[PDB]
Amino acid sequence: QPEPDMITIFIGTWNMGNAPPPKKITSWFLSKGQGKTRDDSADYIPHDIYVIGTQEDPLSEKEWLEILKHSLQEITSVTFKTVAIHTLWNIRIVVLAKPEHENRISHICTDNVKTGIANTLGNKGAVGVSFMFNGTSLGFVNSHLTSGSEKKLRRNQNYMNILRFLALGDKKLSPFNITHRFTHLFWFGDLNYRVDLPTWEAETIIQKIKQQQYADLLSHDQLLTERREQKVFLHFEEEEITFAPTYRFERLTRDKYAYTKQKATGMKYNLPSWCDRVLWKSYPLVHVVCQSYGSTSDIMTSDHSPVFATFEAGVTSQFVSKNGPGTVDSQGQIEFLRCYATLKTKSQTKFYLEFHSSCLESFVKSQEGENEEGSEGELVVKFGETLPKLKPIISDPEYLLDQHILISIKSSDSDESYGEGCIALRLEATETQLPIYTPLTHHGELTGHFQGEIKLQTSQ
Ligand SMILES: Cc1cc(N2CCNCC2)nc(C)n1
Ligand SMILES: Cc1cc(N2CCNCC2)nc(C)n1
């Protein structure tokens, strides 16, 4: 029974509007409706992992699990196993997987973050799940961010609190937040970003939706514009949106957008918006391909339509050699040449690096770099040829070329990370000096760059 090198992952996000679902929700898991939809010929083919995010979910975990498992069984004839379920208030995440994966999935972790203070603490935040799938780490975040067209900045703040404080994945990766801890990270939910057009244009927007002319609406989508200006979700991907706005509908039909201000909305307009989103971030040069991104047309119990996205995701096998795990493989080494970090910091402390990777027995601390002034004001930290030679646990190229090195640049004074990034070992050549590069972030914001050269020695 061979270990897979690809799996498919279903991501669902649905704000249920505090209403029980209708009796049939199979269209969601089949990626049928509007947008980038799944071919009919695939309907019986189960995804490897289904990750369901709900917001305003009125069901118990038991009630929702029963509905999900019965849905998937009807579609696939497979009885899925529950990997994890985690609920904060009415925000929920469920992970289901094919039974054949039960002994491929380990290190299952759940957490939540509550966003806001006093007034704004009580119903918004995020839940998440992480685990290993063979040699691949997977993380999943379902967030319900602050609502309202005039709160895009609050949403961006909610994003940064969630990526800082959600404690998923390997805690030995202490300098790294969730945006670096996983081979593949999927972040979805009712992100609540709106189409920022004047209230007076509501009927014009509705017209555009009826014509399936989304271009002039998406050009005003706050998540697309905030992402373009690097205010949120830096280094994440989103598939092109080709489905109608998923909010705000009159219930029991999809024929009407309910946008006008009401006491029940706090006298706020809800112009048709793409509130419900799926984004991802995978390590460099790992296979990840979005195969669907759309909304259902036939599930109408909520003022939101469910969103689906499916992905091909590259996975690696749990590698065993005669040497590693449990020793090094003398035949393997990673060398860094002519490396320098460029930092946006106004601080003058010395900096050192940490290299973290599953291909190492434990992380490696460098010597301090040499600070110089860059020509445009920047701090440049030069490492020269001073960086430690990394000793991977396995030298086999089939293993080593699939690995990644996380880099943190830390202050000598405070041991606080000023920047985090990631370097793929999927090189064009071994035993060859080759350029490497990663942006550096801290709390998910750009703080600099790391670049230089690598020379990778494998047993071939
Ligand atoms: C909690 C956790 C740990 C972990 N690792 C990788 C295997 N060895 C132990 C450390 N990986 C993930 C995704 N989560
Ligand atoms: C034009 C553009 C590109 C981008 N990328 C691309 C490669 N990795 C993820 C980040 N993100 C945005 C918001 N805009």
Side-chain angles (χ1 to χ4, degrees), residues 2-460:
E3 290 311 299
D5 65 2
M6 221 81 107
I7 61 169
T8 72
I9 302 177
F10 176 97
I11 307 296
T13 181
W14 184 32
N15 182 321
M16 295 178 75
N18 306 107
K23 66 177 177 279
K24 190 166 176 66
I25 58 170
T26 54
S27 59
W28 189 22
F29 311 118
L30 288 173
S31 294
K32 297 298 174 61
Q34 296 187 321
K36 185 189 192 77
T37 62
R38 184 162 183 244
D39 202 78
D40 294 335
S41 67
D43 286 357
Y44 301 145
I45 294 175
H47 294 295
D48 294 285
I49 300 173
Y50 293 76
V51 183
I52 308 85
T54 54
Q55 313 87 32
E56 299 285 84
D57 179 340
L59 299 184
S60 69
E61 289 184 348
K62 168 178 180 181
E63 287 160 347
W64 190 221
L65 274 173
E66 188 186 321
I67 286 163
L68 292 172
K69 287 199 164 186
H70 283 135
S71 294
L72 293 189
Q73 174 131 113
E74 180 167 286
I75 290 160
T76 67
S77 295
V78 170
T79 301
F80 277 76
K81 296 287 196 188
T82 307
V83 173
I85 179 161
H86 187 66
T87 309
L88 165 68
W89 295 317
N90 299 103
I91 311 161
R92 180 174 289 154
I93 185 166
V94 183
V95 177
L96 302 173
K98 299 182 60 194
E100 75 195 64
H101 296 327
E102 194 180 353
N103 306 290
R104 295 177 172 123
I105 293 167
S106 69
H107 298 91
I108 299 154
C109 180
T110 64
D111 197 24
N112 61 262
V113 168
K114 299 167 188 199
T115 53
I117 49 159
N119 270 256
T120 73
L121 200 150
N123 77 295
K124 295 309 193 286
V127 293
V129 180
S130 64
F131 51 92
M132 297 291 299
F133 183 94
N134 286 336
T136 301
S137 56
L138 300 175
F140 304 93
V141 176
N142 174 22
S143 66
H144 192 181
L145 305 187
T146 295
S147 63
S149 64
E150 312 308 293
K151 301 195 172 162
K152 82 188 183 187
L153 168 64
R154 284 286 177 270
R155 289 186 273 280
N156 300 345
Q157 291 165 345
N158 295 157
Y159 164 82
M160 171 184 294
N161 285 320
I162 293 157
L163 71 90
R164 283 179 71 185
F165 297 127
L166 199 62
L168 297 178
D170 179 8
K171 280 43 168 218
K172 288 188 171 166
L173 297 179
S174 58
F176 303 99
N177 62 61
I178 53 160
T179 75
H180 283 119
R181 281 188 179 185
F182 307 104
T183 315
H184 304 279
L185 173 61
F186 296 91
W187 189 324
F188 45 102
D190 181 358
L191 309 188
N192 246 325
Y193 292 91
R194 311 304 179 91
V195 168
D196 219 345
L197 275 175
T199 295
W200 57 263
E201 292 290 41
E203 288 300 325
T204 306
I205 294 161
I206 289 172
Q207 293 204 321
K208 295 302 189 186
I209 301 162
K210 295 178 168 176
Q211 295 170 91
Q212 302 178 45
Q213 288 174 17
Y214 306 136
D216 296 339
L217 306 182
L218 287 161
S219 74
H220 296 273
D221 173 83
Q222 295 168 333
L223 183 50
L224 293 185
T225 63
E226 291 299 271
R227 275 177 34 75
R228 181 168 61 217
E229 290 184 32
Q230 289 183 40
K231 301 301 193 82
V232 78
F233 281 104
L234 181 64
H235 301 143
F236 281 72
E237 310 293 342
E238 189 187 22
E239 181 58 279
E240 183 186 3
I241 294 164
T242 64
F243 48 101
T246 58
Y247 184 69
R248 179 173 184 234
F249 289 104
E250 188 177 293
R251 294 177 197 238
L252 307 186
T253 180
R254 295 293 79 154
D255 294 343
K256 191 186 281 141
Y257 285 100
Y259 65 82
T260 203
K261 68 175 191 183
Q262 290 279 248
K263 282 186 266 173
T265 67
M267 306 301 296
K268 287 178 213 311
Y269 288 92
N270 289 297
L271 294 182
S273 288
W274 285 281
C275 289
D276 308 296
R277 304 292 273 272
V278 176
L279 301 91
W280 72 98
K281 178 186 183 182
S282 306
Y283 283 167
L285 298 178
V286 181
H287 183 87
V288 53
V289 174
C290 179
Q291 292 281 38
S292 70
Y293 190 39
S295 62
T296 62
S297 308
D298 56 345
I299 297 166
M300 302 171 295
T301 50
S302 178
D303 52 0
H304 300 241
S305 294
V307 167
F308 49 80
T310 60
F311 299 86
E312 296 182 346
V315 292
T316 59
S317 294
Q318 307 178 25
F319 216 99
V320 179
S321 81
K322 293 185 187 191
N323 306 311
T327 196
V328 295
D329 204 331
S330 76
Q331 298 159 105
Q333 51 178 101
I334 317 168
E335 302 175 283
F336 297 89
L337 289 90
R338 302 172 56 165
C339 286
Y340 56 97
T342 306
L343 296 185
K344 297 177 187 302
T345 194
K346 292 164 202 183
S347 116
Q348 263 290 2
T349 169
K350 294 187 186 191
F351 288 101
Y352 65 89
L353 301 181
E354 289 179 7
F355 301 93
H356 286 72
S357 183
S358 296
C359 77
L360 312 172
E361 290 223 292
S362 64
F363 77 86
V364 177
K365 275 155 140 64
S366 86
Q367 302 208 295
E368 291 173 327
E370 293 200 327
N371 298 354
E372 320 168 20
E373 171 94 39
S375 83
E376 275 178 287
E378 326 88 293
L379 179 67
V380 172
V381 184
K382 184 163 159 207
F383 289 100
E385 324 280 306
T386 63
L387 292 175
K389 184 188 300 174
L390 305 180
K391 295 315 192 101
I393 61 164
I394 292 170
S395 63
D396 182 341
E398 295 229 65
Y399 168 80
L400 203 46
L401 290 159
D402 281 349
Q403 304 304 309
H404 294 79
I405 312 297
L406 293 171
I407 294 176
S408 168
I409 182 159
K410 287 168 135 199
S411 159
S412 293
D413 290 357
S414 73
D415 292 309
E416 66 199 315
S417 179
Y418 280 57
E420 298 101 58
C422 182
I423 300 296
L425 298 189
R426 186 159 290 177
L427 306 187
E428 284 304 344
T430 61
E431 302 176 311
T432 304
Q433 286 167 30
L434 291 168
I436 57 167
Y437 169 74
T438 182
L440 294 175
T441 62
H442 190 64
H443 303 163
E445 296 200 317
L446 192 70
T447 59
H449 308 276
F450 181 86
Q451 59 211 286
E453 297 181 311
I454 200 162
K455 199 177 127 209
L456 178 65
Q457 191 159 143
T458 70
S459 60
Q460 281 314 134

